[PDB]
């Protein structure tokens, strides 16, 4: 008998409490958030006893939500089209018959010939950009990169509610930019993020990450209850490492890529500087949903709540009557 | 008593009208739209008394759904690694003690020394790419850019219905491409969009936007009722400015980025031309959903409609009987 | 009378079978899959009797989920700023009055003058990068590209369940990478995909696609029932051509873009090599959802199932009683 009142309390609390209130059933929701992100990196570093600025270590440069900060390099200066022996011992050859299709991809095409790379070692010859890259001793990382700064201009708009807000508040001043200390909880509206800070929030050691290269995710969440104040609509920052496979795998431990700088002589012959770049890639991911009171969903939601509590009390009353 | 018939009419109209008909409950919906976009920009401009073509002002060049049209530049010719004073007055120095870590990021690293940039002004010395960039007088914009054209090839497919359509209709001819006048309502299938037109549809003044740089969004919506004709499935174009924070903020008003062109002398020393690029970034955003009649959702939906009207009439009859 | 039992069986089977079991209503679902992709292309080709490696034919180089493998080129060596006649016959001129605004976009700006490109043909003069590109005879494709390899490191994580898996299994070894043969069904965890294989899975002929250029989609789906074994969570590969409009359209049949290599003389004058690149663009699209048993959805789902079967039997009993 009392279980009838108990079931009534559970129905009323669930349908009118969690379902109607906690789940904001009274609210119209906009999930088609419109986001824009623009980035700018600042910092200088010493690498190969040369100073490196944003135009040196940032790529691509257009300042999108995805960019790489180069922290390590294998530089192959003055490559030229020609024939030369493969550098790595993986291409060791003693007989020209060993230089065949079974060989792994290399700096160029295989001539089928076999050549001496050094007095001690002989490898397969290739036609391509010469000389081949040599990966015998590890290259240093750009320590100063830990202090580089990332400037994130993130604009978001829920169009259903014609609501626009950004991580740059309208009262932001040059002094703020010069002195604000970003923190996900303490100061979400500071547009400057310290690269090292981003790496640590992601749970990574800058030394190792900068050695291997990696992909870090900067997630920006705009979950805003437009019923509450405009100043309650604030961005929630999360940080992680997206290439999680890399740490668990010995075959491929990080992130790197190769690109070249192309030059011509007055003579007119082409030569290039090859670059194997290790760096930290930053993906700025923006998500959000907004909700605002609307009478229509309040009517439909409350009507559904009353029909639900009624059907519940009816069925429990029947089940109690028969049993 | 009559309110029983009124409630019956509201239930029947809501569940069989808005819910079943207006909401196309009889329809199976595909929301996993598959989209592809390829872009090509055409136009020539005069800047620094030099002609600039797509390979000069478009970046990146691969013709993706996101690209920048450079409209303004600060060009720093023939930079070389070395030591030089900072150009901007923000780095004004009178004592070498002022050249410290508190200084903002600059062209290079700080030597701690203090040097005379000019007879009137003295600033901090830096090691890096020299000379530093000078932002004393504003640079002009590339007016002709207002007439550049954007070619958008957008292919979409709802795989559930094996439906494929594109903004390029199969009867498109070279004359069409040469003469069609794009309009979101009047001619949605003209693949050529005038940059200036795109800027205005976005509610922006090309002169100001091209001065500050900005991000414009070209949204393409494919909402198609595959029950209706194939020719009713047409793209709906919307235009906006995504970096809305920029206009409301004095600290950062637009969009720009820095990249370099790298050169070598026969002597072998590196020198580069630095470029601070202001431009309009175009993000082509494609969305869509499709619906087609399917008997299953018609059965389940109609059954749910009858159970709903029945439960409604039952509950209203009970509430009327007791009260 | 028997139709009452029939309706009871259909209600019980639908609500407790398809709705509760087949639809895994007992399961909590994570649809906010977190994905990261890194790519690396390997292979060498012969083009213009020059060897081409990843730094030559891959763009952009940063190894993102979207990259192009250049398979065809129109190379315009040593362009210089100046005046020259337009190359293509589309710009044929006999009178300087024909060189006007009605002309289509060209290599540069129009001087309004008319010049002889050859003894047989006269075209409009332009100021810009000279000479203009000549598209009279088709250029070959890089056949070897069919054998290039794409290395895909895809990391995925359902955070709700703190579940992380990747196409690189933790027991992956160098021998595996050297010898595994990718197949969507037979070996989903081989990280090396043969470009030609990808083209064929997409239903395309490499010769034609490489002639015209195109966009191929590599879709990776992680639909995992975390109730089952970890080793049951495997990636499902799908392949397609995203620029489907291209094959149905004569005006634009493929995908190409133009970029330049910029050079300076010791004299200091600029000259560039223009490149019209035809290639295959690969878009790696990752999707997924995960589900794991949770008691809460089991309680709510089973309660809803009993209320549903009860309401069904009640309404069918009433409809049978009255009729
Ligand atoms: C044997 S066929 C093939 N095709 C690829 N596209 C490809 N991309 C990467 N790999 C190989 O897969 C391994 C992991 O790649 P990785 O994380 O880039 O390490 P890594 O920097 O030593 O790769 P590389 O220096 O050899 O370019 C590595 O041994 C690399 O050589 C690839 N192998
Ligand atoms: C003080 S630490 C820091 N780190 C950044 N990554 C960064 N990126 C941009 N800023 C600064 O934030 C301001 C807004 O950036 P902006 O919209 O790019 O304007 P701007 O073109 O004058 O920026 P810059 O010329 O200084 O590169 C501006 O004063 C710029 O100097 C940045 N400041
Ligand atoms: C007449 S205004 C205009 N503006 C564009 N941005 C634009 N982009 C491409 N087109 C034209 O539209 C046609 C299809 O473009 P496409 O697939 O790139 O073929 P294509 O390689 O011969 O294009 P182009 O060599 O002329 O650059 C083609 O004739 C091309 O010239 C464009 N036309
Ligand atoms: C970062 O900069 C601070 C000064 O603001 C300096 O004390 C510190 O050593 C720097 N860190 C690195 C890794 O260079
Ligand atoms: C700037 O405006 C925001 C808007 O809510 C407010 O929270 C903040 O206190 C303001 N800062 C200053 C310095 O007025
Ligand atoms: C350019 O110079 C190099 C060495 O100085 C020489 O090998 C090459 O043949 C020259 N180019 C041409 C086209 O002769
Ligand atoms: C755009 O081109 C038209 C000719 O089609 C010309 O009349 C107009 O002045 C041009 N606009 C600009 C800003 O150059
Ligand atoms: C091209 O086909 C579309 C398909 O609906 C049609 O609307 C249009 O009128 C056709 N144009 C011509 C010139 O036939
Ligand atoms: C290259 O020339 C410049 C000036 O002509 C000179 O400063 C530099 O030392 C030269 N390079 C080398 C390696 O000497
Ligand atoms: C691809 O490589 C194989 C050797 O593994 C060779 O037999 C075949 O001819 C190559 N295909 C092309 C198109 O070069
Ligand atoms: C590697 O681990 C996976 C995990 O399920 C397993 O299926 C596979 O058989 C393992 N391979 C080897 C060689 O142990
Ligand atoms: C550079 O040389 C070319 C031809 O050798 C000449 O036309 C040009 O005027 C030179 N540059 C300058 C600034 O004189
Ligand atoms: Na290697
Ligand atoms: Na500045
Ligand atoms: Na053409």
mmCIF file of C-alpha atoms in Angstrom, chain C residues 19-303:
data_model
loop_
_atom_site.group_PDB
_atom_site.id
_atom_site.type_symbol
_atom_site.label_atom_id
_atom_site.label_comp_id
_atom_site.label_asym_id
_atom_site.label_seq_id
_atom_site.Cartn_x
_atom_site.Cartn_y
_atom_site.Cartn_z
ATOM 1 C CA UNK C 19 14.220 -2.071 -29.081
ATOM 2 C CA UNK C 20 15.843 -3.493 -25.950
ATOM 3 C CA UNK C 21 18.299 -6.078 -27.325
ATOM 4 C CA UNK C 22 19.176 -5.331 -30.957
ATOM 5 C CA UNK C 23 19.301 -1.598 -30.185
ATOM 6 C CA UNK C 24 21.373 -2.203 -27.015
ATOM 7 C CA UNK C 25 19.077 -0.046 -24.894
ATOM 8 C CA UNK C 26 20.823 -1.595 -21.872
ATOM 9 C CA UNK C 27 23.989 0.211 -23.012
ATOM 10 C CA UNK C 28 25.380 3.673 -22.313
ATOM 11 C CA UNK C 29 26.679 5.169 -25.553
ATOM 12 C CA UNK C 30 29.656 7.473 -26.136
ATOM 13 C CA UNK C 31 29.413 9.267 -29.482
ATOM 14 C CA UNK C 32 32.021 11.976 -28.751
ATOM 15 C CA UNK C 33 34.867 9.911 -30.160
ATOM 16 C CA UNK C 34 38.284 11.561 -29.917
ATOM 17 C CA UNK C 35 40.464 10.863 -32.943
ATOM 18 C CA UNK C 36 43.960 11.755 -34.096
ATOM 19 C CA UNK C 37 45.558 10.881 -37.426
ATOM 20 C CA UNK C 38 49.136 11.217 -38.625
ATOM 21 C CA UNK C 39 50.273 10.218 -42.100
ATOM 22 C CA UNK C 40 53.592 9.548 -43.815
ATOM 23 C CA UNK C 41 54.017 8.754 -47.516
ATOM 24 C CA UNK C 42 56.906 6.726 -48.922
ATOM 25 C CA UNK C 43 57.937 6.194 -52.525
ATOM 26 C CA UNK C 44 60.061 7.524 -55.359
ATOM 27 C CA UNK C 45 59.108 8.284 -58.936
ATOM 28 C CA UNK C 46 60.538 9.338 -62.275
ATOM 29 C CA UNK C 47 59.129 12.564 -63.708
ATOM 30 C CA UNK C 48 60.854 14.776 -66.282
ATOM 31 C CA UNK C 49 63.779 12.343 -65.955
ATOM 32 C CA UNK C 50 64.127 13.565 -62.364
ATOM 33 C CA UNK C 51 63.617 11.474 -59.239
ATOM 34 C CA UNK C 52 60.820 12.690 -56.968
ATOM 35 C CA UNK C 53 60.546 11.817 -53.276
ATOM 36 C CA UNK C 54 57.973 12.620 -50.605
ATOM 37 C CA UNK C 55 59.269 16.185 -50.252
ATOM 38 C CA UNK C 56 58.644 16.612 -54.001
ATOM 39 C CA UNK C 57 55.165 15.174 -54.577
ATOM 40 C CA UNK C 58 53.447 15.330 -51.156
ATOM 41 C CA UNK C 59 51.627 18.498 -50.112
ATOM 42 C CA UNK C 60 51.105 19.794 -47.656
ATOM 43 C CA UNK C 61 53.994 18.020 -45.911
ATOM 44 C CA UNK C 62 53.009 18.150 -42.228
ATOM 45 C CA UNK C 63 51.434 14.679 -42.425
ATOM 46 C CA UNK C 64 47.840 15.553 -41.515
ATOM 47 C CA UNK C 65 44.689 13.587 -42.339
ATOM 48 C CA UNK C 66 44.461 15.473 -45.674
ATOM 49 C CA UNK C 67 47.332 15.418 -48.170
ATOM 50 C CA UNK C 68 47.920 15.354 -51.915
ATOM 51 C CA UNK C 69 50.197 13.041 -53.898
ATOM 52 C CA UNK C 70 51.153 14.929 -57.050
ATOM 53 C CA UNK C 71 50.866 12.696 -60.115
ATOM 54 C CA UNK C 72 51.077 15.197 -62.994
ATOM 55 C CA UNK C 73 52.597 18.612 -63.548
ATOM 56 C CA UNK C 74 52.745 21.531 -65.941
ATOM 57 C CA UNK C 75 56.044 23.232 -65.086
ATOM 58 C CA UNK C 76 56.765 26.812 -66.184
ATOM 59 C CA UNK C 77 60.431 27.466 -65.466
ATOM 60 C CA UNK C 78 62.007 30.847 -64.736
ATOM 61 C CA UNK C 79 59.059 33.219 -64.730
ATOM 62 C CA UNK C 80 59.883 36.915 -64.343
ATOM 63 C CA UNK C 81 57.770 40.017 -63.824
ATOM 64 C CA UNK C 82 57.248 41.773 -67.147
ATOM 65 C CA UNK C 83 55.052 41.939 -70.240
ATOM 66 C CA UNK C 84 54.271 39.025 -72.553
ATOM 67 C CA UNK C 85 51.488 37.626 -74.757
ATOM 68 C CA UNK C 86 48.958 35.140 -73.472
ATOM 69 C CA UNK C 87 49.725 31.577 -74.539
ATOM 70 C CA UNK C 88 46.325 29.908 -74.861
ATOM 71 C CA UNK C 89 44.277 30.439 -78.015
ATOM 72 C CA UNK C 90 41.331 31.488 -75.828
ATOM 73 C CA UNK C 91 43.045 34.905 -75.760
ATOM 74 C CA UNK C 92 43.373 35.229 -79.543
ATOM 75 C CA UNK C 93 43.491 38.889 -80.575
ATOM 76 C CA UNK C 94 43.544 40.681 -83.918
ATOM 77 C CA UNK C 95 42.638 44.173 -82.676
ATOM 78 C CA UNK C 96 43.709 45.922 -79.471
ATOM 79 C CA UNK C 97 40.016 46.685 -78.880
ATOM 80 C CA UNK C 98 39.411 42.966 -78.275
ATOM 81 C CA UNK C 99 41.776 43.075 -75.258
ATOM 82 C CA UNK C 100 39.202 44.293 -72.761
ATOM 83 C CA UNK C 101 37.418 43.482 -69.503
ATOM 84 C CA UNK C 102 35.227 40.818 -71.125
ATOM 85 C CA UNK C 103 38.356 38.664 -71.336
ATOM 86 C CA UNK C 104 38.647 35.769 -68.920
ATOM 87 C CA UNK C 105 41.178 35.781 -66.065
ATOM 88 C CA UNK C 106 44.725 35.264 -67.312
ATOM 89 C CA UNK C 107 48.347 35.016 -66.276
ATOM 90 C CA UNK C 108 48.424 38.730 -65.487
ATOM 91 C CA UNK C 109 46.728 42.084 -65.965
ATOM 92 C CA UNK C 110 45.739 43.226 -69.451
ATOM 93 C CA UNK C 111 47.744 46.073 -70.973
ATOM 94 C CA UNK C 112 45.032 46.664 -73.562
ATOM 95 C CA UNK C 113 47.718 46.125 -76.204
ATOM 96 C CA UNK C 114 47.789 43.226 -78.663
ATOM 97 C CA UNK C 115 50.916 41.228 -79.459
ATOM 98 C CA UNK C 116 52.079 38.325 -81.607
ATOM 99 C CA UNK C 117 52.668 35.185 -79.564
ATOM 100 C CA UNK C 118 53.765 33.328 -82.708
ATOM 101 C CA UNK C 119 53.889 33.936 -86.446
ATOM 102 C CA UNK C 120 50.581 32.095 -86.877
ATOM 103 C CA UNK C 121 48.797 33.415 -83.763
ATOM 104 C CA UNK C 122 48.344 36.790 -82.064
ATOM 105 C CA UNK C 123 46.986 37.185 -78.537
ATOM 106 C CA UNK C 124 46.441 39.820 -75.863
ATOM 107 C CA UNK C 125 49.403 41.180 -73.921
ATOM 108 C CA UNK C 126 49.569 40.954 -70.135
ATOM 109 C CA UNK C 127 51.764 42.316 -67.363
ATOM 110 C CA UNK C 128 52.674 39.667 -64.806
ATOM 111 C CA UNK C 129 54.763 36.525 -64.523
ATOM 112 C CA UNK C 130 56.291 35.769 -67.925
ATOM 113 C CA UNK C 131 56.151 33.788 -69.982
ATOM 114 C CA UNK C 132 52.596 32.528 -69.543
ATOM 115 C CA UNK C 133 51.890 28.838 -69.047
ATOM 116 C CA UNK C 134 51.438 26.781 -72.227
ATOM 117 C CA UNK C 135 48.917 23.912 -72.184
ATOM 118 C CA UNK C 136 49.220 22.605 -75.754
ATOM 119 C CA UNK C 137 50.317 18.964 -75.297
ATOM 120 C CA UNK C 138 49.396 16.817 -72.323
ATOM 121 C CA UNK C 139 52.015 15.987 -69.725
ATOM 122 C CA UNK C 140 52.690 12.444 -68.493
ATOM 123 C CA UNK C 141 51.720 11.036 -65.119
ATOM 124 C CA UNK C 142 54.094 9.586 -62.518
ATOM 125 C CA UNK C 143 53.352 5.884 -62.978
ATOM 126 C CA UNK C 144 55.457 4.810 -59.978
ATOM 127 C CA UNK C 145 53.051 6.698 -57.700
ATOM 128 C CA UNK C 146 50.718 3.708 -57.967
ATOM 129 C CA UNK C 147 53.166 1.916 -55.631
ATOM 130 C CA UNK C 148 53.640 4.674 -53.067
ATOM 131 C CA UNK C 149 52.631 3.757 -49.523
ATOM 132 C CA UNK C 150 50.539 5.682 -47.007
ATOM 133 C CA UNK C 151 51.309 5.178 -43.319
ATOM 134 C CA UNK C 152 48.270 5.961 -41.166
ATOM 135 C CA UNK C 153 48.631 6.249 -37.400
ATOM 136 C CA UNK C 154 45.068 6.617 -36.119
ATOM 137 C CA UNK C 155 44.477 6.935 -32.374
ATOM 138 C CA UNK C 156 40.936 6.895 -31.005
ATOM 139 C CA UNK C 157 39.524 7.261 -27.505
ATOM 140 C CA UNK C 158 36.018 7.071 -26.109
ATOM 141 C CA UNK C 159 36.534 9.192 -22.965
ATOM 142 C CA UNK C 160 33.250 8.231 -21.291
ATOM 143 C CA UNK C 161 34.645 4.699 -20.980
ATOM 144 C CA UNK C 162 38.300 5.829 -20.797
ATOM 145 C CA UNK C 163 38.924 3.518 -23.754
ATOM 146 C CA UNK C 164 41.856 4.039 -26.122
ATOM 147 C CA UNK C 165 42.721 1.970 -29.174
ATOM 148 C CA UNK C 166 44.587 2.484 -32.425
ATOM 149 C CA UNK C 167 45.136 0.835 -35.771
ATOM 150 C CA UNK C 168 48.688 0.195 -34.516
ATOM 151 C CA UNK C 169 48.322 -2.661 -32.059
ATOM 152 C CA UNK C 170 50.763 -2.657 -29.115
ATOM 153 C CA UNK C 171 52.394 -5.906 -30.336
ATOM 154 C CA UNK C 172 53.213 -4.346 -33.719
ATOM 155 C CA UNK C 173 56.820 -5.010 -34.716
ATOM 156 C CA UNK C 174 59.176 -3.772 -37.412
ATOM 157 C CA UNK C 175 58.750 -7.057 -39.288
ATOM 158 C CA UNK C 176 54.985 -6.503 -39.295
ATOM 159 C CA UNK C 177 55.446 -3.037 -40.783
ATOM 160 C CA UNK C 178 57.843 -4.480 -43.366
ATOM 161 C CA UNK C 179 55.557 -7.352 -44.406
ATOM 162 C CA UNK C 180 51.915 -6.835 -43.400
ATOM 163 C CA UNK C 181 49.398 -6.792 -46.266
ATOM 164 C CA UNK C 182 46.556 -4.386 -45.546
ATOM 165 C CA UNK C 183 43.028 -5.569 -46.203
ATOM 166 C CA UNK C 184 39.841 -4.035 -44.769
ATOM 167 C CA UNK C 185 38.502 -7.462 -43.770
ATOM 168 C CA UNK C 186 41.583 -9.682 -43.563
ATOM 169 C CA UNK C 187 44.122 -7.362 -41.861
ATOM 170 C CA UNK C 188 42.651 -4.102 -40.526
ATOM 171 C CA UNK C 189 45.691 -3.342 -38.330
ATOM 172 C CA UNK C 190 48.354 -3.094 -41.032
ATOM 173 C CA UNK C 191 49.356 0.610 -40.991
ATOM 174 C CA UNK C 192 50.677 0.608 -44.582
ATOM 175 C CA UNK C 193 48.201 1.165 -47.425
ATOM 176 C CA UNK C 194 49.284 0.884 -51.054
ATOM 177 C CA UNK C 195 48.209 4.012 -52.929
ATOM 178 C CA UNK C 196 47.074 1.904 -55.874
ATOM 179 C CA UNK C 197 45.153 -0.350 -53.499
ATOM 180 C CA UNK C 198 43.441 2.689 -51.976
ATOM 181 C CA UNK C 199 42.541 3.933 -55.462
ATOM 182 C CA UNK C 200 41.015 0.588 -56.425
ATOM 183 C CA UNK C 201 39.075 0.096 -53.183
ATOM 184 C CA UNK C 202 37.649 3.521 -54.073
ATOM 185 C CA UNK C 203 36.510 2.116 -57.427
ATOM 186 C CA UNK C 204 38.872 4.255 -59.504
ATOM 187 C CA UNK C 205 41.360 3.633 -62.310
ATOM 188 C CA UNK C 206 44.732 4.990 -61.221
ATOM 189 C CA UNK C 207 45.696 6.000 -64.762
ATOM 190 C CA UNK C 208 42.644 8.211 -65.280
ATOM 191 C CA UNK C 209 42.510 9.551 -61.716
ATOM 192 C CA UNK C 210 46.212 10.427 -61.874
ATOM 193 C CA UNK C 211 45.584 12.133 -65.221
ATOM 194 C CA UNK C 212 42.697 14.316 -64.026
ATOM 195 C CA UNK C 213 43.422 14.535 -60.320
ATOM 196 C CA UNK C 214 40.815 13.613 -57.736
ATOM 197 C CA UNK C 215 39.840 13.397 -54.083
ATOM 198 C CA UNK C 216 39.708 9.992 -52.387
ATOM 199 C CA UNK C 217 38.200 9.396 -48.957
ATOM 200 C CA UNK C 218 39.610 6.876 -46.491
ATOM 201 C CA UNK C 219 36.906 6.427 -43.847
ATOM 202 C CA UNK C 220 37.875 4.693 -40.583
ATOM 203 C CA UNK C 221 34.956 3.607 -38.396
ATOM 204 C CA UNK C 222 35.359 2.574 -34.752
ATOM 205 C CA UNK C 223 32.029 1.018 -33.762
ATOM 206 C CA UNK C 224 32.905 -0.862 -30.587
ATOM 207 C CA UNK C 225 30.724 -2.738 -28.098
ATOM 208 C CA UNK C 226 32.933 -2.377 -25.036
ATOM 209 C CA UNK C 227 30.895 -5.168 -23.445
ATOM 210 C CA UNK C 228 32.659 -7.545 -25.834
ATOM 211 C CA UNK C 229 36.417 -8.128 -25.863
ATOM 212 C CA UNK C 230 38.964 -5.363 -26.407
ATOM 213 C CA UNK C 231 40.219 -7.280 -29.450
ATOM 214 C CA UNK C 232 36.693 -7.106 -30.916
ATOM 215 C CA UNK C 233 37.077 -3.308 -31.166
ATOM 216 C CA UNK C 234 38.598 -3.140 -34.650
ATOM 217 C CA UNK C 235 38.636 -0.372 -37.297
ATOM 218 C CA UNK C 236 36.373 -0.704 -40.332
ATOM 219 C CA UNK C 237 37.871 0.778 -43.506
ATOM 220 C CA UNK C 238 35.799 2.243 -46.322
ATOM 221 C CA UNK C 239 37.088 3.924 -49.473
ATOM 222 C CA UNK C 240 35.432 6.222 -51.979
ATOM 223 C CA UNK C 241 35.894 9.170 -54.307
ATOM 224 C CA UNK C 242 34.604 12.341 -52.648
ATOM 225 C CA UNK C 243 34.639 14.647 -55.703
ATOM 226 C CA UNK C 244 31.901 12.629 -57.388
ATOM 227 C CA UNK C 245 30.744 15.671 -59.377
ATOM 228 C CA UNK C 246 34.078 15.575 -61.233
ATOM 229 C CA UNK C 247 33.307 12.346 -63.107
ATOM 230 C CA UNK C 248 29.827 13.499 -64.151
ATOM 231 C CA UNK C 249 31.010 16.942 -65.312
ATOM 232 C CA UNK C 250 32.822 17.975 -68.485
ATOM 233 C CA UNK C 251 33.557 21.525 -67.332
ATOM 234 C CA UNK C 252 35.744 20.373 -64.426
ATOM 235 C CA UNK C 253 36.832 16.705 -64.473
ATOM 236 C CA UNK C 254 39.399 16.438 -61.670
ATOM 237 C CA UNK C 255 41.464 18.258 -59.055
ATOM 238 C CA UNK C 256 44.508 20.464 -59.599
ATOM 239 C CA UNK C 257 46.042 23.603 -58.140
ATOM 240 C CA UNK C 258 48.884 26.007 -58.842
ATOM 241 C CA UNK C 259 51.827 26.941 -56.656
ATOM 242 C CA UNK C 260 55.249 28.434 -57.264
ATOM 243 C CA UNK C 261 58.864 27.982 -56.221
ATOM 244 C CA UNK C 262 60.443 31.385 -55.624
ATOM 245 C CA UNK C 263 64.076 32.228 -56.368
ATOM 246 C CA UNK C 264 66.352 35.260 -56.385
ATOM 247 C CA UNK C 265 69.486 35.994 -58.378
ATOM 248 C CA UNK C 266 72.637 37.435 -56.829
ATOM 249 C CA UNK C 267 71.636 40.455 -58.909
ATOM 250 C CA UNK C 268 68.563 40.399 -56.655
ATOM 251 C CA UNK C 269 65.794 40.034 -59.238
ATOM 252 C CA UNK C 270 62.950 37.649 -58.484
ATOM 253 C CA UNK C 271 62.130 34.686 -60.679
ATOM 254 C CA UNK C 272 59.890 31.708 -60.012
ATOM 255 C CA UNK C 273 59.016 28.271 -61.334
ATOM 256 C CA UNK C 274 55.260 27.912 -61.728
ATOM 257 C CA UNK C 275 53.674 24.510 -61.119
ATOM 258 C CA UNK C 276 50.222 23.309 -62.138
ATOM 259 C CA UNK C 277 49.836 20.206 -59.980
ATOM 260 C CA UNK C 278 47.463 17.331 -60.685
ATOM 261 C CA UNK C 279 47.244 14.842 -57.855
ATOM 262 C CA UNK C 280 45.181 12.550 -55.678
ATOM 263 C CA UNK C 281 44.013 14.125 -52.427
ATOM 264 C CA UNK C 282 43.427 11.721 -49.538
ATOM 265 C CA UNK C 283 40.986 12.662 -46.768
ATOM 266 C CA UNK C 284 41.191 10.373 -43.738
ATOM 267 C CA UNK C 285 37.780 10.542 -42.036
ATOM 268 C CA UNK C 286 37.459 8.880 -38.622
ATOM 269 C CA UNK C 287 34.102 8.125 -37.008
ATOM 270 C CA UNK C 288 32.934 5.875 -34.214
ATOM 271 C CA UNK C 289 30.636 5.230 -31.289
ATOM 272 C CA UNK C 290 31.040 2.965 -28.269
ATOM 273 C CA UNK C 291 28.616 1.264 -25.921
ATOM 274 C CA UNK C 292 29.022 -0.356 -22.510
ATOM 275 C CA UNK C 293 26.532 -1.901 -20.103
ATOM 276 C CA UNK C 294 25.359 0.442 -17.355
ATOM 277 C CA UNK C 295 22.792 -0.444 -14.708
ATOM 278 C CA UNK C 296 20.951 2.901 -14.931
ATOM 279 C CA UNK C 297 19.951 2.601 -18.617
ATOM 280 C CA UNK C 298 19.064 -1.040 -17.934
ATOM 281 C CA UNK C 299 16.616 -0.017 -15.199
ATOM 282 C CA UNK C 300 15.082 2.854 -17.163
ATOM 283 C CA UNK C 301 15.002 0.817 -20.377
ATOM 284 C CA UNK C 302 13.410 -2.264 -18.802
ATOM 285 C CA UNK C 303 10.862 -0.142 -16.922
#
